[PDB]
Amino acid sequence: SQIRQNYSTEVEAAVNRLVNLYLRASYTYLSLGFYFDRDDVALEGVCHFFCELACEKCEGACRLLKMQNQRGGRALFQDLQKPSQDEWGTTLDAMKAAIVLEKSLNQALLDLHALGSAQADPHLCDFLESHFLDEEVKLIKKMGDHLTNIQRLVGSQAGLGEYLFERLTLK
């Protein structure tokens, strides 16, 4: 490569894996969003929340690909694994699955920082800081806030709570 400078093969491979995780997360959120659009589930605000996350994870993948090319790395695409469930249960079940997924992305980001730090690659570290580390923390906080409100609303009338959360928080 004519442009590549201070860009380890280890970072290049890790960036390709992270693209694959972001795209699988996008696909998962696509599945979650259509599940909540089913006529027998019918929680529009839950569909909107997950379809917006599908878009944000795709954007994360696009950003990582653009950065791979800017550094002289080579994008390599793998199979995208189907999402872990076909049916996602309650809003609560789905928001718990989403926070597990987000913590796994966050761990992949922290693991890529550790690799970039070991490889002395400050451009990579700046890239993760600028577009990923804070966005992921902000999203996990919001999902935690959602899980607390959903859990509060379960009590004894679970249908009522699920309706009210969708109507008054996911508006």
102-131 binders of its own copies (CB under 8 A): 103, 106-107, 110, 113-114, 117, 120, 122-123, 125-130
Q: Residue with structure tokens 């693209």? A: 19
Separation of alpha carbons 170 and 53, rounded Å: 13
> Tokens for 164?
């009210």
Minimum CB–partner distance for residue 64 and Cl ion (Å): 22
Which residue's CB is nearer to Na ion, number 94 or number 109? 109
Closest CA to 135 of 31, 74, 53: 53
DSSP state of 83: P
Q: For 8, which DSSP code? A: -
Residue 61 sits in the site that holds Au ion (CB under 5 A): yes
* Beta carbon of residue 77, minimum distance to Na ion (angstroms, whole number): 27
104 binds, among Au ion, its own copies, Cl ion, none (CB under 5 to 8 A by kind): none
Please provide residue 104's backbone torsions phi and psi, each rounded to the nearest 5 degrees. Answer: -70, -40
Q: Contact letters (x/-) for Cl ion, 44-83, by CB under 5 A? A: -------------------------------------x--
